[PDB]
Each structure stands twice: as structure tokens, then as C-alpha cells.
């Protein structure tokens, strides 16, 4: 079942974004583990696995629509120097992912391509809840608890 | 004390078994290397069985106050392809069966009956668990076709 060329194009853009986010979460989780912030490490590891599953779902949808996934192309990685910086970078990338996902969902709706709209809506719900909500909560917790208290909560049991 | 002739025949049978075991091992690892996991597992089982048989033969030779010759080994007819391996194995096993029949006759003649019981057990093993399976494999390589037989031999991927 051939899909719209525009639908495949925006799906490929979504896949590029998801793979870039997966790689950024990979780097951030590994630097968190290196620093000793174990709780943040596990959370970002689960977030990276979620991004990998999202990318897999996008690839399956693209292959179903007889497209060719653009898995070679990647976006610029924003790697933060310290924990607040990586949290802010993750939140910024998640918000950009939200914007592009809304645009892609609108395009899929205009193209009468409703199964892909369902997958993209599920991806948008996962991104808003598991990623944007958690990261904005983390930023607020850094603001409230303070830097040292948040880092202590992130380090877990030493 | 066992007879000189009986101990000699048993050492011969032991050499046969040792060569068979080595050949079976080489073939099984070759098949594993090629990816034919099912046939590899089967051949490994056969090699283990041959090892057990050789061990029984060694024990028997030792009980008769004779010295086992586990340094002598026959030539290893090794096949380059699966049907070749199967044919080679069948040939070797048939030779071993002939030798075993002769040995059983000698043991019966020399009034050695426990040795003959061991040899008869080994003969059933070599004609059923081995020669029969190999003959069946050759027949199936001819019936199924080499391609289908190899696909069956690969089992799972």
C-alpha cells in the first residue's frame, strides 16, 4: 500500500529526529553513569530504549508504505556539560520533536492516512508524557530542591 | 588371561573404533562449521557413542591381562561435502562391521563368551545406531535431493 510521498518524507524526518534523540540519550546516560548519578542514568537509559522503540515503529511504518528509511542522516547532537545543561538540552529537543510531530500528525490527517496518524499520536503521547513532562519536572526540581539536593537525589545510594 | 588371538582381534577392533571416533568428531565439527546444526548434533551423539564403545573395548582388553593399543589409528577418509562425508562414514562403518563379525566368530571359537557378548552389543550398535542411519541419510540425500536434504540438515537458522 503506497503512502503519500509527503507522508513518507515527514516520517523520515521524524525517524531522523528519533534516532538523534536516541543517540543523545545514549551519550547523556553514559556520562551520567560516569559521573555517578545512577538514578538519572537508569531513567535516561529507559528513555533511550523508548526512543529506540519509537524509531523502530517509524521504520516499520515507512517500510509498510513502501518508502526507504533515512537512517543514515542524523541531526546535531546537543551534549550538555553538566546535569542541568543536559536536562535543558533534552527538554529543548523534546519540544522540537513535539512541534514536528504535531506538524506530521496534521499532514497525515490531511492525507487521509489514519493508521500512521494513530502511530504518530501514540508517539506524541509518549513524548509529551514520558519525556517532556518528566524533563520539565526535573528542571523544576533542580530549581526547587537546589543543585546539590537534586544531585544527591540523582546519585542514589552510594 | 585372554588368548593372544582374542586380544589381538580386540585391539584391532579398538583401533577401528578409535579411528571411527576421530573421523566422526572431525566430520561433526566440519558440519557445525558449515551450519548444519542438526546433522552436527547427530554426528556428535554418534561420536560420543563410539567413544563409549572404545572405552568398553579398552576395559575388556585390560580385563584379559592384555595391553590396549590406543596409539594405532587407521586412515581418516574425510569428505569435502555432506554427501561425501555420509558415504565415507558408511564405508568405514561397513568395514568395521565386517571386522566385528570376524572377531565375534573368533571369540565364539576361542570359547570367550563375555567378550563375545560385548562384541555382539557393539555389532548391534554399529549396524543399527550407525550404518542404518548413514544408509538412510544417503538414501534421503538421493530422494529429497541434495538441496532439500541440506535444508533439513541445517534445521533452524
Amino acid at each position: 500500500p503506497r503512502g503519500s510521498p509527503k507522508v513518507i518524507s515527514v516520517l523520515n524526518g521524524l525517524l531522523t529526529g528519533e534516532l538523534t534523540a536516541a543517540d543523545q540519550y545514549f551519550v547523556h546516560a553514559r556520562m551520567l553513569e560516569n559521573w555517578g548519578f545512577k538514578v538519572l542514568y537508569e531513567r535516561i537509559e529507559h528513555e533511550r530504549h523508548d526512543e529506540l522503540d519509537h524509531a523502530g515503529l517509524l521504520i516499520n511504518r515507512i517500510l509498510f508504505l513502501e518508502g526507504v528509511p533515512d537512517v543514515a542522516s542524523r541531526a546535531a547532537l546537543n551534549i550538555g556539560s553538566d546535569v542541568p545543561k543536559m536536562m535543558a538540552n533534552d527538554l529543548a529537543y523534546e519540544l522540537q520533536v513535539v512541534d514536528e510531530l504535531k506538524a506530521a500528525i496534521a499532514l497525515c490527517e490531511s492525507e487521509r492516512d489514519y493508521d500512521t496518524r494513530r502511530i504518530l499520536v501514540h508517539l506524541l503521547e509518549e513524548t509529551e508524557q514520558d519525556h517532556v513532562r518528566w524533563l520539565e519536572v526535573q528542571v523544576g526540581l533542580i530549581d526547587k530542591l537546589g543543585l546539590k539536593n537534586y544531585l544527591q537525589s540523582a546519585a542514589g545510594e552510594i | 588371561x585372554x588368548x593372544x588371538x582374542v586380544x589381538x582381534x580386540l585391539n584391532x577392533x579398538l583401533x577401528x573404533x578409535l579411528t571411527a571416533x576421530x573421523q566422526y568428531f572431525x566430520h561433526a565439527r566440519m558440519x557445525x562449521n558449515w551450519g548444519f546444526x542438526x546433522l552436527x548434533x547427530x554426528x556428535x551423539x554418534e561420536x560420543x557413542x563410539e567413544x563409549x564403545x572404545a572405552x568398553x573395548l579398552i576395559x575388556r582388553i585390560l580385563x584379559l591381562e592384555g595391553x590396549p593399543x590406543x596409539x594405532x589409528x587407521x586412515x581418516l577418509x574425510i569428505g569435502x561435502x555432506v554427501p561425501x562425508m555420509x558415504x565415507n562414514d558408511x564405508a568405514x562403518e561397513x568395514x568395521x562391521x565386517x571386522x566385528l563379525x570376524x572377531x565375534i566368530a573368533l571369540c565364539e571359537x576361542x570359547x570367550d563368551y563375555x567378550x563375545r557378548x560385548x562384541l555382539x552389543x557393539x555389532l548391534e550398535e554399529x549396524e543399527x545406531x550407525x550404518x542404518x542411519x548413514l544408509x538412510v541419510x544417503x538414501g534421503x540425500x538421493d530422494x529429497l535431493x541434495x538441496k532439500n536434504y541440506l535444508q533439513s540438515x541445517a534445521x533452524x537458522x
Binding site: 560516569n34 559521573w35 555517578g36 539536593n149 544531585l151 544527591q152 546519585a155 552510594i158 | -
Partner: protein, 154 residues
Amino acid sequence: NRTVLAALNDVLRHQLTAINQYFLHARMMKNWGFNALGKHEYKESIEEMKAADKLIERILLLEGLPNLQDLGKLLIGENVPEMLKNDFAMEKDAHADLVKTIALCEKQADYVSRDLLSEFLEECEERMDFYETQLELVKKMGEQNYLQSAVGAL
């Protein structure tokens, strides 16, 4: 080879000094109520003790007599971060000597000794990373927060 056994004995002396320092530090950590860090130090002492056991096996297998008499200078810290720094320094020196001994074992073709020393080096490097991470945590979380974490269960 005389040199391989001498280097193994030097590694053993370093390991026994590490054992004593680790156990002493764990004991004064429990004495101060720093339970989490005290338990971690105790398990590190246990790991170093098992490693010294393995090295004593290896030296005795090489027809060489272990030297359990000697002990390097102990580095005892007055407070938890000082213990972390002293542990890191001791592990740095032990790791440099371990690398030298691994290279020597390669020169003399004592490959089983080299494999055992490589395993010991993996342990030493994970310990070094842990202590560097702990010191950075002291810097970032602060002394009070890090000590509260080291307390664990009150």
C-alpha cells in the same frame, strides 16, 4: 623466573597494604556512622582480600614463596573525603605497578600470570573510577549531602 616472582611479590605487598588500608578505613567509617560508605569499603576490602588470595595461589604455583611480612606505608584519612583521596592515590600507584608487571609478564611469556594480573587491573581500574566518581560527587553534592548519603540507614 626470578624477576616475575619479584614483581608478583611487589604486587602482593601492594595488595596487602590495600587490604589493611581498606579494612581500617571501613572500620573508622562504621565508627563514625557512615554505614553506606562503610559497607562499600568493607566489600572492597573483601575483594582485595580474595585477589590477594588468588595471587598467593599464583606465586606458590610458580615455586616462589609469598612475602606477607612486608607492608607499604598506610594512608589513613582523618575524614571521609580524605580517605577517598588516600584510597585514590594508593590505587593509582598500585595500578601503575600492575601495568608494569603485566608488561614484564608479557616479556617473559608468563601468560597465565599476565591474565591474572589483567583481571586484577580490571578490578583496580573499576575501584579507581569509583573513587574518582566519589570525589567528584563530594565536590558536586557538597560535603554535607555526600556525608548524609554515606550514612545511608540511620
